[PDB]
Design a protein around this ligand. Structure first.
Ligand code: A1AZD
Length: 133
């Protein structure tokens, strides 16, 4: 269980041809989760420069929407749960573990260029843990 550094570009600035493909600075992503090992997903529209914990936070917003939480109650729940999970590129041993604008990760910036939908798996942070020798 080696964990590799984040696969990011050298600058958060988007090249001209990629910047002009944003829809009012926003992108759409699909977030998968294992629930039986059944799968559920969210399709979320987010600012391109959201950091991975803000993506997990938006999914927390969607999950608790029916509770009619106030902004303070949502902040409390987000601070409690957003650190217990991590985002992983579907089908690849690559994680978004560090605070970078999402579009600075090479997988996301490639999805924006090619017009492809980013697919990410939200997983428990403990699955990264290696046992001690
Ligand atoms: C924020 C906390 C941690 C309190 O929310 C949970 O306990 N989540 C559930 C456990 O999954 C653990 C990880 O889940 C999350 C953790 C953080 C943010 C969002 C989720 C999340 N939750 N549900 C998702 N779909 C989903 C719909 C309906 C059901 C059936 C049902 N009647 O519950 C089950 C489902 F799974 C999806 C789909 C994509 S992300 C996501």
């Amino acid at each position: 269980m080696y964990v590799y550094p984040p696969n990011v570009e050298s600058s958060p600035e988007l090249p001209k041809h990629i910047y002009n493909k944003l829809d009012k600075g926003q992108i759409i992503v699909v977030i998968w989760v294992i629930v039986n090992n059944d799968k559920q997903k969210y399709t979320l529209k987010i600012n391109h420069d959201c950091v991975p914990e803000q993506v997990i936070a938006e999914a927390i917003r969607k999950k608790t929407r029916s509770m009619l939480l106030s902004s303070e109650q949502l902040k409390l729940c987000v601070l409690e749960y957003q650190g217990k999970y991590i985002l992983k590129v579907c089908g690849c041993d690559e994680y978004f573990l560090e605070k970078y604008p999402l579009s600075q990760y090479k997988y996301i910036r490639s999805c924006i260029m090619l017009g492809r939908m980013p697919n990410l798996m939200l997983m428990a942070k403990e699955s990264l843990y290696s046992q001690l020798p």
